[PDB]
């Protein structure tokens, strides 16, 4: 049962990661339209598509894809929140310019 | 009286083999649970960031 669940969740995770990459690309394009060339690879998250192909005797853990000090909540989410704060500051600056 | 001891030995051997199988199954189940929770938390973080 858990193997079927893990296969389904892995497929859902791959779809979600592809959606996240598409949204990151769209955001990068939108920032670049105003001259802010955001590094696409900085915000993208890389996950191996063959991770589940390992035999279940071998362990798969969050620390393998996101060791301490590098998780999404740890670095990526904080980095994108900082980007949002910077864009808000740019909004304030352009509002003062307007 | 002898079939009794033979059956006891057979039960012990089958128990040992099934215990090895159970240990392997426990390792597989723990790995599956870790993988599932890892994927779930990554999905939740990805949706929050989205």
Swiss-Prot record, chain A:
It is found in: Nucleus; Chromosome, Centromere, Kinetochore. Disulfide bonds: none annotated. It comes from the Eukaryota. Acts as a component of the essential kinetochore-associated NDC80 complex, which is involved in chromosome segregation and spindle checkpoint activity. Component of the NDC80 complex, which consists of NDC80, NUF2, SPC24 and SPC25. The NDC80 complex is formed by two subcomplexes, NDC80-NUF2 and SPC24-SPC25, which are joined end-to-end through their coiled-coil domains. It has a rod-like structure with a length of 570 Angstroms and globular domains at either end. The NDC80-NUF2 globular domains are probably directed to microtubules, the SPC24-SPC25 globular domains to the centromere. NDC80 probably interacts with SMC1 and SMC2. Also interacts with KIN3. Interacts with DMC1. Present with 1160 molecules/cell in log phase SD medium. Belongs to the NDC80/HEC1 family. This is Kinetochore protein NDC80. It comes from Saccharomyces cerevisiae (strain ATCC 204508 / S288c) (Baker's yeast). The chain holds residues 446 to 543 of 691 of the full protein.
UniProtKB/Swiss-Prot annotation, chain B:
It comes from the Eukaryota. It is found in: Nucleus; Chromosome, Centromere, Kinetochore. Belongs to the NUF2 family. Acts as a component of the essential kinetochore-associated NDC80 complex, which is involved in chromosome segregation and spindle checkpoint activity. Component of the NDC80 complex, which consists of TID3/NDC80, NUF2, SPC24 and SPC25. The NDC80 complex is formed by two subcomplexes, TID3/NDC80-NUF2 and SPC24-SPC25, which are joined end-to-end through their coiled-coil domains. It has a rod-like structure with a length of 570 Angstroms and globular domains at either end. The TID3/NDC80-NUF2 globular domains are probably directed to microtubules, the SPC24-SPC25 globular domains to the centromere. Present with 1550 molecules/cell in log phase SD medium. This is Kinetochore protein NUF2. It comes from Saccharomyces cerevisiae (strain ATCC 204508 / S288c).
